[PDB]
Amino acid sequence: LTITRIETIPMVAPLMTHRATIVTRVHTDAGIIGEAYTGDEHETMFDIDRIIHEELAPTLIGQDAMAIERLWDSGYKVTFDILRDRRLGLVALAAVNTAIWDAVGKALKMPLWKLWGGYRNELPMIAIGGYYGEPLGSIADEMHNYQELGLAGVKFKVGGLSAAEDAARITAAREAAGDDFIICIDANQGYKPAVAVDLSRRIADLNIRWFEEPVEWHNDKRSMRDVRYQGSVPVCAGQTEFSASGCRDLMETGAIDVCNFDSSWSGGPTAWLRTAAIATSYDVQMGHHEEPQVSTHLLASQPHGTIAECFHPDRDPFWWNMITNRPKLNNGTLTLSDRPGLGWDLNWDYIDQYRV
Amino acid sequence: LTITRIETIPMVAPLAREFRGSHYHMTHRATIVTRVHTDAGIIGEAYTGDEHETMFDIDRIIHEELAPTLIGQDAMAIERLWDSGYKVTFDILRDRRLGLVALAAVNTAIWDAVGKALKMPLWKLWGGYRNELPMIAIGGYYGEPLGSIADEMHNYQELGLAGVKFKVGGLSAAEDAARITAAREAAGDDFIICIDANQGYKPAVAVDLSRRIADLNIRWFEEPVEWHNDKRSMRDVRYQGSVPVCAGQTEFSASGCRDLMETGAIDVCNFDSSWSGGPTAWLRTAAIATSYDVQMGHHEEPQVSTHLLASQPHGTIAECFHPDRDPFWWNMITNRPKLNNGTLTLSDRPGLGWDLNWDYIDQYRV
Amino acid sequence: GLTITRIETIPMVAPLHRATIVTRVHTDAGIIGEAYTGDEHETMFDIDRIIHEELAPTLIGQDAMAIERLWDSGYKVTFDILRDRRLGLVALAAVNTAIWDAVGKALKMPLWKLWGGYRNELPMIAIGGYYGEPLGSIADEMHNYQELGLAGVKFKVGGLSAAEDAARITAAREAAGDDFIICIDANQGYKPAVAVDLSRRIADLNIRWFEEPVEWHNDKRSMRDVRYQGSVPVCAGQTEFSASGCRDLMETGAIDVCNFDSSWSGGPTAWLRTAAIATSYDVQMGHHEEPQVSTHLLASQPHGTIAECFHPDRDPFWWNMITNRPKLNNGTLTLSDRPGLGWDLNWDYIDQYRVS
Amino acid sequence: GLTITRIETIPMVAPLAREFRGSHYHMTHRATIVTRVHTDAGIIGEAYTGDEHETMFDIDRIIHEELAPTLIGQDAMAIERLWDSGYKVTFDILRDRRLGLVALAAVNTAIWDAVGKALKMPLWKLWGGYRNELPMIAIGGYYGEPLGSIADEMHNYQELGLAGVKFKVGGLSAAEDAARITAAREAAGDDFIICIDANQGYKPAVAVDLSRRIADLNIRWFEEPVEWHNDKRSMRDVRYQGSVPVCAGQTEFSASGCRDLMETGAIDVCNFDSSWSGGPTAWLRTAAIATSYDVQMGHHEEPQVSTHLLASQPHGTIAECFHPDRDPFWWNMITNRPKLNNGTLTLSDRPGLGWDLNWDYIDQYRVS
Amino acid sequence: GLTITRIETIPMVAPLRATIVTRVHTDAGIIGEAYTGDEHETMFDIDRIIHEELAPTLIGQDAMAIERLWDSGYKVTFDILRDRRLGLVALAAVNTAIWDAVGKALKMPLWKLWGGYRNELPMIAIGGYYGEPLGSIADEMHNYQELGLAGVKFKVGGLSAAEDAARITAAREAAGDDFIICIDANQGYKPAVAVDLSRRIADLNIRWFEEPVEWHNDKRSMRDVRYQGSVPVCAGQTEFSASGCRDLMETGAIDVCNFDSSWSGGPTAWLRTAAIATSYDVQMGHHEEPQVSTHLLASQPHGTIAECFHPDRDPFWWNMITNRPKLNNGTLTLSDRPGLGWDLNWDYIDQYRVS
Ligand code: NA
Ligand code: NA
Ligand code: NA
Ligand code: NA
Ligand code: NA
Ligand code: NA
């Protein structure tokens, strides 16, 4: 399945004020086009685009798209550049690896959730929320609103206030949503460990699903381990790692119950699936930081996959508009069709309107 | 103390009841009585473990592989004989348990012989920390084959037992939590309750259960999680849960037990001597345990565990099956100490100090 | 049982000013357990005090056969935080060793056999190669050891550069010839890079082991590094306080041989725990000097190595305190079947040098 | 540079009122050594460090025979050079490692006082300058009640302006020491820091049992909960199976030993004692290591040096003293000791450690 | 106190390399100055962080309270949306200049304020670039010996073991024995190839092997190179924090840590790493930045060797500082001038400063 061309369409939409993404398309001599959109970059989008066209495309043009390990291995060298942020190469590699996978699922007439393991084809979906400042309303309104939308739960933002104050915020969300609602919390690396342990004990009776990135970045593995063992809530991390080796270090340290490694930031499905294999050997569950357009397939494929994540429409336009055949949530869950590849129909009006 | 003969008596108990499979099942239980004869008057003897399926391969290893390293040798040079015998574990082609069981069989009979020669009961020869300890029963089988939870618990109490190792691992956390609550409610507060999942849970479910039972004073939570990543996963049950964790019975060597302790997986190590190369191996584990502040248990085999555990400053509690799972403890030893209020007390009889029921043996051998 | 009736000690001092305490445990059966242990000059009377004021009470009227029981209560004297932990440990070793002699005698078993009975003969080497050549040139010293029928030498290094000490070690090997064990001992003298340098220089001299190559504070990890980066097996353990400390050495991968000293560390009961731990790590056992106890200890174990003594002028106890010392033959000592330690103490020498 | 001309030491011994039993140890005297490091610039670095009744003279000899010759004539400003040469006193395998380390700490602390004076800087600032105010608690709750009933002792600490207590345990069962701690909380009430200290007295299961029993009394930390031989791993277990933060380090000889505690996950707080372990130079290495592990720093007693050490560091916690009947030195040695107010003291801007030593007290208790 | 009154930066681009001169003004008359980093592409992003995020935490505060200021400054690294190096470089810039002010106020050279172990250490040059931009291997080596440098840090990581071994071998032949030779793979090899190379050069007295292996598993893989191979291993420059340096040491990855203060929050962070290193018997080095590393390394008992570039490769060390110490027998001796003690060449700064 020979690659003939790599096409990219940088996009910027509004509702900061804008979210950025890149649509990547891999054309083949069969008339099959692999397509995906990846990342939410922002200030670095065109540098990423450059890496895609100048560094990766030559490794790909004329090559067999079906030999994913061969191509991934040569494309990996874009991560070696010591004189720039390693994320740039990783996001660029993720973009092409994801679009290639979509082409390959298409050539094989297999949806990716099946090609990648086929464990199941439905999972729950939660919304990232509880933003400080009540942007999407009060805590209770936000929670009710997600329930209206038919989401299974929320990953609720903490990390900014005292343990006492954030516990009250979480108690409010649990109150509002009632018991039949998944509540995860996410500190975005905000707490000193003692404060995170304090918080974790205060919410021990609110059935919190996991506590994501509880502690400051520098000692995060060992300090989140201590949060996991002194506290009372399962711990989730991985999104901040660059590689499967980094996620392996989390697991080896005993830092985590759930790995939320982000394939869009970290070299794509090929990378993420290595992390998932590693997680099985540690009895660690897989999650995935946002990117529902690829995470739903990745997570469903796996026996140890958990929950997909998205934003409220007003905060992410891309999942809610750019995909014309997104399945309807039913009582919290999303079921994936048997459409080959990622199986998505992109709204090309929206793309034309917002490409830069 | 020269070894002259190695005699083994393969044995198969009557068709007893089997506690597995969702249904009524029956199976014969099997053991091997091993007797090490010596130039003095002394005969060391022990019996080791239910095997039934593999009993004759083990018997063959004993005679074709071990005996040649023993006959003519000095039984009192235990390390020399164990080291020479250890080679039976090397065979990559067969289950390693075959070799380790054969080695334990002989190593234990040899210890019984050495103690007789020195006129020492083994609990004293092995260290002599004390001569009495609690004994609990294994029970709480799914399907209530030994009665309701309550009646089963009351029964063990009336038998003079200190407590129970109660089977879990087969239901949800909530469901198994309720079974353990019923056991504590029935037995009251002065009864040891351990629980045993037989590697049945995924770690989050074990943790859920462990927390649910935090106020029932559960003594320990034995093999809570699946086998493949058991050391790290049970460490997490230990740290995220509320109950001490116990394991070691599934390990093949003291190296394996060392691995569990270094991972931080366990509070109690229940390494089984009879299926891991015998008391010489178990005593090495016990030593390693002291360096980690880990306590020693012993999966069943009361006939040897009573002495092993009692000898050690960090020994905990001896275990025994129901007669149907183990007719050997109950019928084949005619001078078992009588349980007094949870406790078993050991005599000063040299060796393991046991009088075997030769009528029982003559009727079930071959 | 075997009831202990009284504890007698006989503090001693002999010039070379080496110190030792003879301990005698008297029993019902008229059996007396006796041993000498240690060379702690300055602290002897502190140790002596601990035995009579702290240990003896836990012992008089107890069954000496119940070794684990008595060791467990005796161990509490190591809990005193206001004094060198070694004081309690050496006092406990004194009593524990004597008791074991009592038990061996009571059961008519030599300790080498009662402790496992692996073999009854082992090589013995002399600790020497002192700087300043007090015992003569390196060549003279090596030949003298061979005249005494010793299997080899533990040769002092740790005080010069790698190039100078490698040359000294080269001299030892050339004088002695290949059929002679040469261990080397830095007494925690080198920086790790210097020890690695030395180890590589002597890789062809068949050096049996490299004992305590590096400075004390980080010795486990640094000697691990000498072990892996260098070319000679590494030995340590004598500076640990407990079988826990030896386990830490083994778990770090610091050592091929553990030379934990029973007389400094709670006695045979403690050393045998260390021995057991070593089997689980495929580590061999050695024993820093104290041949009057180490011979039985090492000989009883399948993984035992070599016993050690000093030149007669450096330390006189081994050569004068024991009237029935076996004859060295081809470098090896063979132990009799006499029960307990089986030693006839030289009461001329004891009566002459005892003190209050 | 600041050339060292002379090293002078003054050993002291003072009697204590009664005996003070912890768990498996007790005390009748308080000994210390005052070290003075003279310089060609007229500045005298001074400190007193340690309590070492039995071995005081052994330590004094090390100072003079082993250390002084590496210091006389050298530049007191070159701390790392001096410390690197003095460190050899720790190498002798034939003697207690602590002898050398206490000797080294003695001169290192006095040399730091001289350097602070030369630079016109208080050490709490020279060493990092994070803050100049911190809480002080008293080490107390001794068994036998030699300072009075539990309640009386707590109230008295509150009347001295102290922030809380480090309360001795480790000697009884979990249920019994739990009762004693419960009594301290009830007496002091909630606005009072209660640490507990088993001095390595419990088996891990007993420490965990106690930890869990006191989960609701807001206990700040649990110091050396377990027996010494396997302490790092066993206190890790107390830390994760129990309910209160764990603290240790005082029993380690070096920063390498503290690093081992932290790597094992043994501790939330490291209470490494500078005056037993080579002085502020060694301690500040440990503090640096602690930052990389998100471990906080404490300091076993020695308030005359630990106030500056702890206050300098972002992750410094609580300074420690004893009741005056238990230790007269903090309370008599220093004429300008800052006042305890509402649990805290505030250090001045006086250069060095900033202390005026009470020569009238010193002369009454010096020995030879 | 030494109250900070103004944070001034001067971004520069010189032909060509890039840097920022940071100047911390105080209410005394003292101006702390340093230049730090080469960051061409993001220089202005950093400059912005300095003024918009850091300056407000510093104006009117006591420069003498270094732990306090560093603590509140450290938050510029929390930003999850940008490269963590942006904040860490900004933090290093102000922290280095703050230290120079502090040294000046206390009248102490920093090599002495930071410990004073010694005031003299060897300097090597980073070189042996592929494509021979500075001449053949033999001519480059001789050049460095003419300049009076102690040795070279010689680039590898790009070829096969046999081929890079030949190059390294030419360097030792050309230079002779009395010349320090470190090699640097810049994370280039798979472990087996680094091991092969290390064994091949076992006889060439190679001082250390910097960043031998690919990035993703570098800690464990470089430990294996260290133990299977024959040459000491050095790494640290690619770590973001003393925690990451601690991780290298705990894994047994390194003999030498070359943490770069300029990239990692300044001397305060590097000196924490330095303390951690004592506890592991790890030695300290420092990736280039000799204008700060000479003082950092000289102050520590376990400090090793300072690094610069050939003049044609780096104009800053060679031009920015008018009282640069002369190499003498491979070594640089630092003066007693307070702070970093450097006189900056303002003609050069005026020439190449940019906006
Ligand atoms: Na997150
Ligand atoms: Na916990
Ligand atoms: Na079991
Ligand atoms: Na030695
Ligand atoms: Na304490
Ligand atoms: Na480099």
Automatic annotation (TrEMBL), chain A:
Q: Which residues bind Mg(2+)?
A: D186, E212
What does the UniProt keyword field contain?
Metal-binding
Top-level taxon of origin: Bacteria
Q: What is this protein called?
A: Mandelate racemase/muconate lactonizing enzyme
